[PDB]
Design a protein around this nucleic acid. Structure first.
Ligand SMILES: C[S@@+](CC[C@H](N)C(=O)[O-])C[C@H]1O[C@@H](n2cnc3c(N)ncnc32)[C@H](O)[C@@H]1O
Ligand SMILES: [Zn+2]
Ligand SMILES: [Zn+2]
Ligand SMILES: [Zn+2]
Lengths: 89, 103, 78, 101, 245, 94, 78, 104, 92
DNA sequence: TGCCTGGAGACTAGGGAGTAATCCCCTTGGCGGTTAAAACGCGGGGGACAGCGCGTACGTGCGTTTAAGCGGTGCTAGAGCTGTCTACGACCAATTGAGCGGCCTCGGCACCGGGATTCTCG
DNA sequence: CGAGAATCCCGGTGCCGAGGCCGCTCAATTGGTCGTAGACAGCTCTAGCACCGCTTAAACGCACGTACGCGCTGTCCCCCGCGTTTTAACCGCCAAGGGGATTACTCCCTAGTCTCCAGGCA
């Protein structure tokens, strides 16, 4: 079980008439897993320093702002904020 | 309906919530964290695939290869900073020759 | 002596990929020792993970975990 | 009446042509069976009667080639900073000293 | 004096005023060509790295792909996929940009060429074109043709196994002589994956001066020959008792 | 009475490799930190935060001048130059 | 302009501790910029931890965590 | 009522290490020999570094141990320099080292 | 508020290998930071080893494997020997 | 396409976090005095840089040799997946002693000053 | 080789931080019950190892020539040791008050359980 069909769903939206090899699919799988592990580990570190027992969207946002570069983190925070705003409204 | 249809995303939310509850990170997990993290992962995936598709169209191809991923990552200012300690298999290097060696 | 199987034109070809125009005569004997030390470290950690996992075959995920332990993440063999 | 040869290339042209030729491609530059025999020989020192897969040796070869290419990329900068073209082992030792190895 | 006309005429052998006893030749022809080469697997394209403008010529206009190109320094002509397109100046074997040549008599050593007008250094003159042999036919045709009592042998070794004959068909580069003071020379250019032999100049040759190239000296039989130029240090004969090829 | 140039330099090398004190003053460094921390307006600092910043900054600078000296010796010189600092920060990975 | 408060004798004493015998006249403008970049990175991380902690005071443990994030690992301040 | 440190023969505590393992989000279950093993390893490393620190304190004709003595004790041993190669010690200084070309 | 430390335990270790030697507060803080850092490294490596083999319990075998990967040379041999000697005496 | 295993929909309890109050510790601002350290010239010796000459080590090229790939076949150690069950860890009740905080006390070490030794250079 | 600036040694004074001692909490200890995680056994089947014949592309070795690394010499710029003057760092003291930190109360958010049913993987 992997993220391959979801990588196809993302790829067919930004470039319609293109394909992708299985080696590049494995590299994208490793990239998604690595970024997941980095963000989850930093959000696990942030929740221990304040003696809290819950990882929240504020914890994930603080782990995004520490890890990503300047122009990338702003768009990541904006996309995540829009997605968590559309979840309740 | 699924929560990925509620949030409007493409990556799943239940698998991310299961991996948060399963991988021993904290005691409790909230409600906006897998949606937020799925949006971040979808944005990063779409950026990598956009630059890879541009690098694939620049060489008259229709299939993205690890060389196209290598050129897309190393020809960007911030993705090279995020992925500086990562070795991509079958990726190669960037073509460059120092100016004190050319005749 | 299988360290002599890493031939001279292979090291020259790696230096041509690295951007080196002219090569002296001791770079090969230096590079063999550097490669030997690096491979001994990675094989030591991979065999440590394999002996911990109670197996007898050395898989590729043990090599990926050892390279992550050195600090050199490898995408593709997961 | 003899058959004359045209000319001979100046030293450096074929070398820069090989630099472009091997920076354009993406392949394995080391033979596979001597590398496999070397890995098995140095792995006999840690545990007798082991067994290997193929991707486990392919990943080692990818990591080793990337390490050596990065080492030569820093060592060429060392040799250029020393105001030379030929690459010396003292440049390799300086690169491994400043890098932290 | 050259007067290339397709009708065969009444001049026996010397080819100084009537060029239609033999046949001329375009880019060379092959006999046993097989698809084992580095043609379209790694030398598919070798594209230069140029960011041109190409909209400002004849006024603040630099010529495209000059002596700063990656391909001209490495003795390679560009392909049709160049970013300059049909304005690149590397493609000189394909657009047939030649020099003004003429063939008349200069000395009793034989026929040759003399420069029409001024011609600067590193300027292309003519391409060596002929018939490409192979392994077996060379050592049979040389002993079949040595018994025909010919003076001029039009043999040039392209590689260790390729020797080009310019006897049955030859262009205007077959008349050029030998001297111990060379002003032109030969270079090995790689066009479309295939290796080709050209002729460049080295100095500022005046209008009405000789244009010869240096031979890499070679004997094949027992006899010897000598040169008649005598610039300053003309050896004439070969380099001793050598026997290499 | 004058010394040949280099004796006082080696004396300073010996005494500052023997000593363990801080070399940068405290009020200019504190004003530098409080100037460049203006990120978030109207902050507030403990003393141990600046005391840790000064230790880390001087350790980083000594560890950079060591490799600068190694590059200058490799270039068969004695005087250090900014290109040696650029080579050290290029090989170091910065 | 408090970067000019890192004077020339202070950089010279840091170079004397670093082992440097002879110093040119252009080292100082490079050293001030390198120090400024390092302090901007560490102060940015410390202010990010402080803003997450809902506090107005930057403590020392925020600085130790900001140095641990970059691989410095300072001992002596907790 | 003997403790577990007296039963194991160690000087570091066992219940504090067990509490820090159970309250640190490492795993669901914690074995009964792991804090004993880890306290033995930490006690060995503590004694190993304090021996070299006391040797440096005897060499510099002092009674107490200072961060300069700790710096000398770590940087004069090769295995401790490899284990702690990315550690900065406050008020510890550097090592005396002058290159052989800088001096006549 | 009452806070954990290792100062009395470092003092008990110091008064066995050097019977006449003092220690300052700065050196005691450096020793506390050292013990905490080595604890965090070994516990994190053991928790990483516990997840690869799909286990739930961290035992002395995972702790020994985390020590063997992390300590270089003969120091790992002596650490394994001291730990095995301390675990052997605990069961009896 | 089969299907089945993981994801969604309600409902409830309990404790985790959010708000308000108040103490008092520690951060910031200010004024003066002393003097150590930074700033500014100045003469000069040393080193960085440029030019030139020479010998050799490393490049390109050709012919011979060798073993890396490339298939085909066969045998088997060992990875992988279910079943039993038993021993080991989570959890709670009661208890007591080890360790954190506060308080005196004295001695290792830091500053100062005199006398003699050790490297430096013209 | 002998003036001359650093530098080591010896003693005296005194002081503030390391260390012993005590009172007292709260967390380690011991006992007992229950559930379930892994240890062991056993069956299947699959890639890993070993051998064999053929081809041909890469490695090796020798010849030769020339561009470059290294050594020497000359010049002139520029950094260093030293002396004098100016400046603000450091210590000491004082005072206002802002926010860390702790406690008490209360709402509400997510883990757990049961039922249902479709999304994605071979
Ligand atoms: C390319 S042709 C050059 C001139 C040729 N004879 C012509 O008129 O076209 C080469 C042949 O001419 C002969 N040749 C050229 N130069 C010569 C010379 N200087 N002395 C003697 N023979 C010469 C050689 O023997 C060779 O076989
Ligand atoms: Zn071009
Ligand atoms: Zn072009
Ligand atoms: Zn001649």
């Amino acid at each position: 079980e992997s993220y391959s069909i979801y990588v196809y769903k993302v790829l067919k939206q930004v470039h319609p008439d293109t394909g992708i090899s299985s080696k590049a699919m494995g590299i994208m799988n490793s990239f998604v897993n690595d970024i997941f592990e980095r963000i989850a580990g930093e959000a696990s570190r942030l929740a221990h320093y304040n003696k809290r027992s819950t990882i929240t969207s504020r914890e994930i946002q603080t782990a995004v702002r520490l890890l990503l570069p300047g122009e990338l983190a702003k768009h990541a925070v904006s996309e995540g904020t829009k997605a968590v705003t559309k979840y309740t409204s | 309906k699924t929560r990925s249809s509620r949030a409007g995303l493409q990556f799943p939310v239940g698998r991310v919530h299961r991996l948060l509850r399963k991988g021993n990170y904290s005691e409790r997990v909230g409600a906006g964290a897998p949606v937020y993290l799925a949006a971040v992962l979808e944005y990063l995936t779409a950026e990598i695939l956009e630059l890879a598709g541009n690098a694939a169209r620049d060489n008259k191809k229709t299939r993205i290869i690890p060389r196209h991923l290598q050129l897309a990552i190393r020809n960007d200012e911030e993705l090279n900073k995020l992925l500086g300690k990562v070795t991509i298999a079958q990726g190669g290097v960037l073509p460059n020759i120092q100016a004190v060696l050319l005749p | 002596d299988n360290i002599q199987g890493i031939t001279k034109p292979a090291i020259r070809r790696l230096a041509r990929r690295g951007g080196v125009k002219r090569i002296s005569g001791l770079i090969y004997e230096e590079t063999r020792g550097v490669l030997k030390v690096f491979l001994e470290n990675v094989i030591r950690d991979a065999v440590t993970y394999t002996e911990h996992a109670k197996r007898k075959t050395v898989t590729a995920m043990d090599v990926v975990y050892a390279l992550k332990r050195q600090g050199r993440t490898l995408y593709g063999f997961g | 009446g003899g058959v004359m040869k045209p000319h001979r290339y100046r030293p450096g042209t074929v070398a820069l042509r090989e630099i472009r030729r091997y920076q354009k491609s993406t392949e394995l530059l080391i033979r596979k069976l001597p590398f496999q025999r070397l890995v098995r020989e140095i792995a006999q020192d840690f545990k007798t009667d082991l067994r290997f897969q193929s991707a486990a040796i392919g990943a080692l070869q990818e990591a080793s080639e990337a390490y050596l290419v990065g080492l030569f990329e820093d060592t060429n900068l060392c040799a250029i900073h020393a105001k030379r073209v030929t690459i010396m082992p003292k440049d390799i030792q300086l690169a491994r000293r400043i890098r932290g190895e | 004096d050259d007067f290339r006309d397709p009708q065969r005429w009444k001049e026996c052998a010397k080819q100084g005023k009537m060029p239609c006893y033999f046949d001329l030749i375009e880019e060379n022809v092959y006999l046993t060509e097989r698809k084992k080469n580095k043609s379209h697997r790694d030398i598919k394209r070798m594209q230069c790295e140029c960011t041109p403008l190409s909209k400002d010529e004849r006024a603040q206009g630099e010529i495209a792909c000059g002596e700063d190109c990656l391909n001209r320094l490495l003795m390679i002509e560009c392909s049709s996929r160049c970013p300059n397109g049909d304005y690149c100046s590397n493609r000189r074997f394909q657009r047939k940009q030649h020099a003004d040549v003429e063939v008349i008599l200069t000395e009793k050593k034989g026929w040759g060429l003399r420069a029409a007008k001024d011609l600067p250094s590193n300027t292309f003159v003519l391409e060596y074109c002929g018939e490409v042999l192979d392994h077996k036919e060379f050592k049979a045709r040389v002993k079949e043709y040595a018994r025909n009592k010919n003076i001029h042998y039009y043999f040039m070794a392209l590689k260790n196994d390729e020797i080009i004959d310019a006897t049955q068909k030859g262009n205007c580069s077959r008349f050029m002589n030998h001297s111990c003071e060379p002003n032109c020379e030969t270079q090995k250019w790689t066009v479309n994956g295939q290796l080709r032999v050209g002729f460049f100049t080295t100095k500022l040759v005046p209008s009405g001066s000789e244009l010869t190239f240096d031979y890499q000296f070679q004997r094949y039989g027992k006899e010897a020959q000598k040169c008649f130029c005598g610039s300053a240090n003309c050896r004439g004969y070969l380099g001793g008792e050598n026997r290499v090829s």
